Design an enzyme around this catalytic site. Structure first.
Site, PDB file in Angstrom:
ATOM      1  N   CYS A  30      33.460  32.414  45.193  1.00 36.01           N
ATOM      2  CA  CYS A  30      33.362  31.018  44.713  1.00 36.01           C
ATOM      3  C   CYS A  30      31.981  30.534  44.920  1.00 36.01           C
ATOM      4  O   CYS A  30      31.547  30.382  46.107  1.00 36.01           O
ATOM      5  CB  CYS A  30      34.393  30.070  45.440  1.00 36.01           C
ATOM      6  SG  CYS A  30      34.231  28.289  44.874  1.00 36.01           S
TER       7      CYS A  30
ATOM      8  N   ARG B  92      36.892  32.450  35.764  1.00 40.00           N
ATOM      9  CA  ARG B  92      37.839  33.574  35.995  1.00 40.00           C
ATOM     10  C   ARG B  92      39.231  33.245  36.519  1.00 40.00           C
ATOM     11  O   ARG B  92      40.011  34.188  36.687  1.00 40.00           O
ATOM     12  CB  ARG B  92      37.230  34.615  36.937  1.00 40.00           C
ATOM     13  CG  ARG B  92      35.796  34.915  36.523  1.00 40.00           C
ATOM     14  CD  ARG B  92      35.054  35.613  37.595  1.00 40.00           C
ATOM     15  NE  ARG B  92      34.522  34.677  38.574  1.00 40.00           N
ATOM     16  CZ  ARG B  92      33.865  35.018  39.668  1.00 40.00           C
ATOM     17  NH1 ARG B  92      33.603  36.309  39.939  1.00 40.00           N
ATOM     18  NH2 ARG B  92      33.454  34.079  40.504  1.00 40.00           N
TER      19      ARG B  92
ATOM     20  N   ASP C 132      35.786  27.512  38.048  1.00 41.25           N
ATOM     21  CA  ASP C 132      35.349  28.910  37.772  1.00 41.25           C
ATOM     22  C   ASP C 132      36.099  29.539  36.613  1.00 41.25           C
ATOM     23  O   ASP C 132      37.326  29.482  36.605  1.00 41.25           O
ATOM     24  CB  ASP C 132      35.580  29.747  39.021  1.00 41.25           C
ATOM     25  CG  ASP C 132      35.059  31.196  38.874  1.00 41.25           C
ATOM     26  OD1 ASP C 132      35.673  32.025  38.182  1.00 41.25           O
ATOM     27  OD2 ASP C 132      34.025  31.467  39.448  1.00 41.25           O
TER      28      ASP C 132
ATOM     29  N   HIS D 241      39.207  30.657  45.682  1.00 42.86           N
ATOM     30  CA  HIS D 241      39.079  32.017  45.167  1.00 42.86           C
ATOM     31  C   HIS D 241      37.844  32.625  45.765  1.00 42.86           C
ATOM     32  O   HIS D 241      36.826  31.942  45.951  1.00 42.86           O
ATOM     33  CB  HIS D 241      39.007  32.086  43.632  1.00 42.86           C
ATOM     34  CG  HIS D 241      37.776  31.456  43.106  1.00 42.86           C
ATOM     35  ND1 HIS D 241      36.670  32.184  42.744  1.00 42.86           N
ATOM     36  CD2 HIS D 241      37.433  30.141  42.965  1.00 42.86           C
ATOM     37  CE1 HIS D 241      35.694  31.346  42.390  1.00 42.86           C
ATOM     38  NE2 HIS D 241      36.128  30.098  42.528  1.00 42.86           N
TER      39      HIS D 241
ATOM     40  N   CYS E 273      39.647  25.876  41.296  1.00 41.54           N
ATOM     41  CA  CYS E 273      38.229  25.772  40.981  1.00 41.54           C
ATOM     42  C   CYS E 273      38.058  25.803  39.479  1.00 41.54           C
ATOM     43  O   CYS E 273      38.897  26.396  38.739  1.00 41.54           O
ATOM     44  CB  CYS E 273      37.421  26.906  41.670  1.00 41.54           C
ATOM     45  SG  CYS E 273      35.635  26.666  41.442  1.00 41.54           S
TER      46      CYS E 273
HETATM   47 ZN   LIG Z   1      34.765  28.465  42.645  1.00 42.17          ZN
END
Ligand SMILES: [Zn+2]
Ligand SMILES: [Cl-]
Ligand SMILES: [Cl-]
Ligand SMILES: [Zn+2]
Ligand SMILES: [Zn+2]
Ligand SMILES: [Zn+2]
Lengths: 222, 222, 222, 222
Positions: free
Chosen positions: B101, B46, B44, B98, B42
């Protein structure tokens, strides 16, 4: 034998060390994220944004694709752009290319008849190349490759600034800056290739192509 | 405020520190790359693969998009897949979702009329959701979220396996494994969700959807 | 010898005849259009909407693609949809498939490893097929082909109704109807395969898949 | 109001009338198609190829989209191109723009911040416009519109010629010509804008952009 054991062990060892050093390293972003950066760079295995800027989880939201390309018609890159600017309210967009970029070489040398999806995908690079023939013809293969890299970073910064997302953000007063940078895999360093752009004014100053004419083309009509 | 200086210092400090520990950390990777992994994950902020598996430059080629989605009809993800399998000859594909998400939450809760490109883009998430609606009915918000993340990893592992690029690679005896992993941002830890798949036989044993039926559907016509 | 002469002559002859018969046939739509229909059908050379419904220029706005597919992630089909519903205010959307559809056959029989763009493109048909295994397994190749055609028309009507464009139009009270029809190249006739849908109520009644649960999924969560 | 009856009667009347004039008008095309043409044209309701060239079923395979645009990275248009050139073995490709084209007007006047998918989609039109800005500066609204339509036809003829599908077809000696035509909705007439292109040599003579340079760019590197 494919077996993820060594990978998982290295991950556990890494997670332990970070938490041992700062006990809220992870827990603080358990349930949420607030990055200030979007980074758009190449899928190339030598170029990892969080690690080259030495960043903690939760700092840089990341699109990585073959060639670091941005097009309004790629919903993959565009949703990364919309989600971070509209939903997360990031403040800075890093467009990063890098030397020894294989996408940028394929863009110089492949014949368009080449089979498969990568050759479709890098059509964008050919177009950047074609507009910049005068800067590339007659250079040695190596200098043309480096130059292709920089020219692509500049095209992609322009595409970021021209996108509907960034244009709507500027028009509503949301602070947002765009950055062109390039990385050298052989030295691990990043150079700023284009100074910060924060709106149309900077763009007029810093980019070869004319962003104002692109946005307001019909003003130049009678 | 738009200044990049903090980032460039960090990059410098980072590059010197690595060049000290190891003389050739960058120089050995200056003119080519031979990664063994492709990672799809992803966007994302993190979830940074080279950081979380603690890898050096040159080890993992990366695709990141919103929801770590894999579709035959997305040339962005597909060119990452084709270039690594066919040109770079990677051996292992990591598909990584993850928990927490936002893409997966959006695919549960948003109404389809929502405007913008993120909503178009996460249509794959609604499809996974709909096919598995029985598994999600009457769970709590938070539990449906976690289950959605996991079902999404499995769907995307199926799509990698079913792709023309991987099916062709297997059919010519190229060794290539595919793995489903999930990361927990709150702890920094990866958990293996799906054991290694190295060919049609593993996929028969490991996936809930039938890959063989998908590939050889017409065998069961009269 | 490629030479367009016969084509141009046939076009002049046709234009003359129509204008001779009705002197404003063309001039009335010189500078504008107001179709009431959008038609989505197959690129197949035997299926021309304006001619099979015996329509005048300016009546039916047309998307034609391999297999008559509608996906939220195809900006080609989606801009046809948005432009006619949002800008032109059409009132009816015809989704038409047809027997002896080669896209629908490739969707039954091709192995996903097949090279080229058509095989990527028809991934949509495979997915419709996979969800409907119980209706297709064990039929003769010919009956499976016909059945694939109808099942695809139904999936694509559902996709029209579920699209952000049609959903936003209904939610704001704009009258809009969706129609599933199929055409037989060997007899020149069109059969209504799905009765008119004008909003969620009809959709609940007329479609196998559950459109309400798709739009309001989070209501079925605890 | 949502009733389809008028349309079905029209289709019936139409099918009988044709079956009278010619016994086998439909039956001869019941189980296959051997068209000689692929037509790519605008989705605009006034421009129906089989009607305007006065063709019978089975003669022209059709792609229609907003702005009659051809891009390597659109699988919808590309699969129409691949399936006809590679599977059906067509001989002629018609690229057809039309005066009074709303897509071309939008590509002149809309600001890039405009929301929705049509604006993403017509990005190709802005690119053609920008490359040819010198040709459009200080023309009147209406004249710039007509010139945009024509420049667009030429750009899209270049893109068909430059496509992997056509380049591969030529390179294996498949005979295949490409034509640029424009339709005037007000008169029903087609005008040939670009004479037939049957290979690299014709394209050198007929197109303003250099196809050879595009295909063999690296020949001019040191
Ligand atoms: Zn995500
Ligand atoms: Cl990364
Ligand atoms: Cl048509
Ligand atoms: Zn690269
Ligand atoms: Zn068909
Ligand atoms: Zn048009």
């Amino acid at each position: 034998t494919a077996d993820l054991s060594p990978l998982l062990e290295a991950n556990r060892k890494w997670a332990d060390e970070c938490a041992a050093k700062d006990s809220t390293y992870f827990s603080k972003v358990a349930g949420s994220q607030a990055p200030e950066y979007l980074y758009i760079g190449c899928a190339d295995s030598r170029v990892s944004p969080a690690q080259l800027f030495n960043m903690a989880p939760g700092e840089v939201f990341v699109q990585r694709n073959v060639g670091n390309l941005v097009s309004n018609k790629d919903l993959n890159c565009m949703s990364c752009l919309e989600y971070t600017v509209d939903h997360l309210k990031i403040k800075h967009i890093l467009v990063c290319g890098h030397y020894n970029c294989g996408a940028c070489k394929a863009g110089l040398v492949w014949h368009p008849k080449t089979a498969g999806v990568t050759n479709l995908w890098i059509s964008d690079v050919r177009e950047v190349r074609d507009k910049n023939a005068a800067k590339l013809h007659g250079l040695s293969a190596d200098d043309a490759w480096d130059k292709m890299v920089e020219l692509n970073v500049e095209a992609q910064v322009f595409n970021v600034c021209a996108s509907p997302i960034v244009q709507a953000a500027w028009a509503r007063g949301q602070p947002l800056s765009v950055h062109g940078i390039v990385y050298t895999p052989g030295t691990g360093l990043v150079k700023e290739l284009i100074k910060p752009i924060t709106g149309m004014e900077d763009a007029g100053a810093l980019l070869r192509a004319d962003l104002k004419q692109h946005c307001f083309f019909s003003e130049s009509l009678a």
